[PDB]
Amino acid sequence: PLPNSEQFYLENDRGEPYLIQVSWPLHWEDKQTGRGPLPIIYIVDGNALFLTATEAAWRRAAASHFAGGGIIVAIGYPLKGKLYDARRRSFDLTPPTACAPVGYGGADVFLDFIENSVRPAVQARFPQVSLAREALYGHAYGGLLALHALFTRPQSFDCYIASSPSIWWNSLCILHEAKAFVETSPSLMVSWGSWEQHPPRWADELLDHYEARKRTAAELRMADNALDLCAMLHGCSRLHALIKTEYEGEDHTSVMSCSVSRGLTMFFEDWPFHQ
Amino acid sequence: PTPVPLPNSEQFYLENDRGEPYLIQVSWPLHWEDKQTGRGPLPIIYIVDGNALFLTATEAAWRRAAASHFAGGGIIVAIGYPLKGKLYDARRRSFDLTPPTACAPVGYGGADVFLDFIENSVRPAVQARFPQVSLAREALYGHAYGGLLALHALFTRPQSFDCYIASSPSIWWNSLCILHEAKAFVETQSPSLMVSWGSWEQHPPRWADELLDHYEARKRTAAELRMADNALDLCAMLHGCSRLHALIKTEYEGEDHTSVMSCSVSRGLTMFFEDWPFHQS
């Protein structure tokens, strides 16, 4: 198996199973090496990102700005042959709305599960560690969850990392929560790939196929919805720092490697962020 | 709690002709039921400093299954060392990843021994584990000294691999000795080259709470290594060469020498698996 990591299953309050995967700095002899304050990052769609987050964190040990590292927690599902549970994540990652279809709108149930079950479970694995600060990372619907958490329960985490957040979802319903947040401190990192809204044509791709991809990309409006949200949050009293990043040449999938790696690195090594 | 298993993967030890040990780690597309699932032509990528990059390359490859341009994926081969508690073997890699020169210190200049090991031991060993797969094309990836190895392989044995991916190559090494081989290469099916580096490598930003004297020392070292400008000089030197099919160069904005590894290995395997052949450049 992988070194310096473990996994276990937790059930939420309605009996639904979750795979919790945890890793810690590679230079430790065991879990009990860790003593005192450490940063911790919780990653939703855990199956898709645990290994990259884990290994990127380990790579930092060779970097000049390394400060000791932290704990990676991936919150995922029991899966074989794939990285996502479409049915489960559709409920867990989307906020409640009156017009949401059946099987959506369970974000608050999931956030309660993270705070009341996952956090104490992980804390019990490192009883001599104190959690200095906590970050919530998610991508796509996971990014929507991260934004929802910030706007409705800002004190729950210190840093929210929204990678390519699905702001488009349910007629841009997240922007009502953003408006209430500003009109009423943690930090926010928002990112997206430059090819998400404006994809280049592939080699040998025929025109109708390409124009269809461009139309879908325009409808999702990844970059401009993110920029609109960041402009709304600009100069907000309830947000310490807002960092926005367009990754040049990355698509919706490829940007995940970049965003999870930078997210954990900045949260571990560059904290606190500038005002 | 239990240990974390890695599905659709395995590892095995191989030693070179000199009796020195290697850990070979291999992974294949996650949607396969087992190794036997794969049949016919597939791309394969060999990654040096294997311990440092295997999991990211593996998982990035698996993430591509949900992408629109997915074409069945490929095989990841990480060529590493027996290690505990760290990702690099400094002594072993110093020999394996640097080319032979007359002024190279003791423990350097073993790149050709290592490339022979990859071609004559690692490649057949991996082929034997996927007997019903044919290797459609082969890429060699390396970072830092690994990038120097990739460039050395291109310039001295160009037909060994189809694609060479040099992430932040240590062109500075040994008074820029690699440029002699680059010059000979240009003055002599063509392979392709991907070169990349982070924008913070040559021009690092100041850390929070860092004293000015310490920061100026980092800037001095960065100026000496000359990561971006040495890479740009080499790319200009190779540009329009008839022995190279394509030359792709990328500066990753806001990435340092370590952080850029996540980006470069992920893009390298993705482009090699999904965007081949590259357009002429």
Side-chain angles (χ1 to χ4, degrees):
Chain A
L2 273 57
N4 294 38
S5 58
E6 67 186 9
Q7 62 175 228
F8 53 91
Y9 294 95
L10 293 180
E11 297 183 354
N12 68 1
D13 298 355
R14 53 204 69 183
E16 300 177 320
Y18 288 87
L19 178 65
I20 310 303
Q21 297 176 300
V22 184
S23 67
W24 50 92
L26 188 61
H27 72 278
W28 292 10
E29 304 304 81
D30 50 49
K31 271 200 301 305
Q32 285 74 49
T33 301
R35 298 183 165 280
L38 294 174
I40 183 164
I41 181 162
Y42 301 92
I43 299 166
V44 305
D45 294 317
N47 306 78
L49 292 151
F50 178 62
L51 305 171
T52 300
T54 294
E55 202 181 56
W58 292 344
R59 281 194 288 278
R60 297 311 302 174
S64 304
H65 204 33
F66 190 62
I71 299 164
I72 305 301
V73 181
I75 305 161
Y77 308 97
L79 291 171
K80 180 178 163 167
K82 62 186 186 180
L83 302 175
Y84 309 94
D85 192 313
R87 186 180 61 77
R88 293 286 302 284
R89 78 190 290 276
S90 290
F91 189 61
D92 290 351
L93 305 181
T94 56
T97 72
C99 66
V102 175
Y104 294 83
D108 300 319
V109 177
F110 185 47
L111 289 166
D112 284 0
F113 170 73
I114 296 168
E115 295 203 77
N116 301 328
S117 301
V118 180
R119 170 184 293 153
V122 172
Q123 181 63 86
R125 305 306 299 162
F126 308 90
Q128 306 304 306
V129 170
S130 59
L131 305 180
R133 51 178 184 283
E134 304 184 279
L136 180 63
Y137 175 101
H139 179 80
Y141 283 174
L144 182 62
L145 181 73
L147 293 173
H148 175 68
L150 172 59
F151 304 144
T152 63
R153 54 176 78 194
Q155 297 182 327
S156 293
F157 302 87
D158 299 276
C159 191
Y160 300 85
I161 309 173
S163 178
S164 307
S166 302
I167 292 165
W168 62 266
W169 188 78
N170 201 68
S171 307
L172 299 93
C173 64
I174 198 71
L175 302 185
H176 256 300
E177 297 189 340
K179 186 173 187 164
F181 177 80
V182 301
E183 289 179 353
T184 289
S185 291
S187 294
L188 175 61
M189 297 176 66
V190 183
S191 70
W192 61 93
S194 77
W195 289 4
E196 293 197 61
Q197 196 173 323
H198 299 291
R201 190 168 175 177
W202 306 323
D204 311 321
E205 187 178 14
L206 302 175
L207 183 62
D208 283 357
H209 191 276
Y210 179 52
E211 291 293 326
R213 287 205 301 122
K214 288 201 290 183
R215 195 199 180 188
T216 301
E219 288 168 6
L220 298 175
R221 199 168 185 275
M222 180 57 61
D224 289 320
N225 285 349
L227 290 163
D228 285 352
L229 177 59
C230 291
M232 196 189 310
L233 301 172
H234 183 83
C236 178
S237 59
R238 302 178 73 197
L239 199 62
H240 171 76
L242 178 44
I243 304 182
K244 66 180 197 298
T245 305
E246 180 171 282
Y247 290 98
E248 186 174 25
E250 303 297 338
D251 58 47
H252 188 66
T253 302
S254 72
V255 75
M256 296 177 75
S257 298
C258 308
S259 70
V260 79
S261 189
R262 184 175 295 184
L264 75 88
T265 301
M266 288 184 69
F267 185 66
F268 288 178
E269 297 178 12
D270 299 296
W271 191 268
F273 308 151
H274 309 336
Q275 206 183 342
Chain B
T2 65
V4 181
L6 187 64
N8 296 40
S9 69
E10 66 193 12
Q11 62 174 41
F12 57 95
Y13 296 87
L14 283 181
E15 67 181 23
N16 66 5
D17 69 321
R18 314 307 180 75
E20 299 179 312
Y22 291 84
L23 177 66
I24 310 303
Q25 296 174 295
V26 180
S27 66
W28 51 92
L30 187 61
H31 73 276
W32 291 10
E33 285 78 0
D34 42 49
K35 285 194 310 201
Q36 167 164 321
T37 306
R39 206 194 308 171
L42 292 171
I44 184 160
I45 181 162
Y46 301 92
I47 299 168
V48 305
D49 294 315
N51 305 80
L53 292 155
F54 176 61
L55 303 172
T56 299
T58 293
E59 203 181 56
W62 293 345
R63 281 193 289 278
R64 296 312 299 176
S68 302
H69 207 22
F70 191 61
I75 297 166
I76 304 300
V77 182
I79 304 165
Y81 308 97
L83 292 172
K84 187 189 173 69
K86 64 189 185 179
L87 301 176
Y88 309 96
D89 192 312
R91 186 182 60 76
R92 293 288 305 285
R93 77 191 291 277
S94 290
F95 189 61
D96 289 352
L97 304 181
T98 58
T101 73
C103 66
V106 175
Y108 295 83
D112 300 319
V113 178
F114 185 45
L115 290 163
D116 285 357
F117 169 71
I118 295 170
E119 294 203 77
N120 301 328
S121 302
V122 178
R123 167 187 295 153
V126 174
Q127 181 63 87
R129 308 229 168 188
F130 304 91
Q132 72 217 111
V133 173
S134 57
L135 306 180
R137 52 177 184 282
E138 301 181 277
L140 180 62
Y141 175 100
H143 179 79
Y145 283 174
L148 181 63
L149 179 72
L151 294 174
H152 176 67
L154 172 59
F155 304 146
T156 62
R157 55 175 77 195
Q159 304 305 318
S160 57
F161 302 89
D162 300 274
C163 191
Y164 301 85
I165 308 170
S167 178
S168 306
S170 302
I171 292 165
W172 61 266
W173 188 77
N174 199 240
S175 306
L176 296 90
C177 66
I178 197 70
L179 302 188
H180 297 300
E181 296 181 351
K183 184 175 170 194
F185 176 80
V186 299
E187 292 175 3
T188 299
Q189 176 52 223
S190 293
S192 296
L193 177 61
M194 294 178 68
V195 182
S196 68
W197 61 93
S199 75
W200 288 3
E201 295 194 64
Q202 198 174 321
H203 299 293
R206 190 170 175 181
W207 304 326
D209 309 317
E210 188 180 10
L211 296 170
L212 181 59
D213 194 64
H214 189 273
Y215 179 51
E216 290 294 330
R218 292 204 299 121
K219 288 198 290 176
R220 189 186 175 189
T221 300
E224 289 166 19
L225 300 184
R226 199 166 183 276
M227 178 57 62
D229 291 325
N230 286 350
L232 290 161
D233 287 349
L234 179 58
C235 289
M237 186 170 169
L238 299 170
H239 192 263
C241 176
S242 58
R243 303 184 73 200
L244 203 60
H245 173 77
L247 176 66
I248 304 176
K249 59 178 170 64
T250 306
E251 181 169 286
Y252 289 101
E253 186 179 14
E255 302 297 341
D256 56 57
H257 187 70
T258 301
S259 72
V260 75
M261 296 176 79
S262 295
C263 309
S264 70
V265 79
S266 189
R267 184 174 296 185
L269 74 89
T270 301
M271 290 184 67
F272 189 65
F273 288 179
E274 297 176 9
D275 296 294
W276 191 269
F278 306 147
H279 191 53
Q280 296 94 320
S281 57

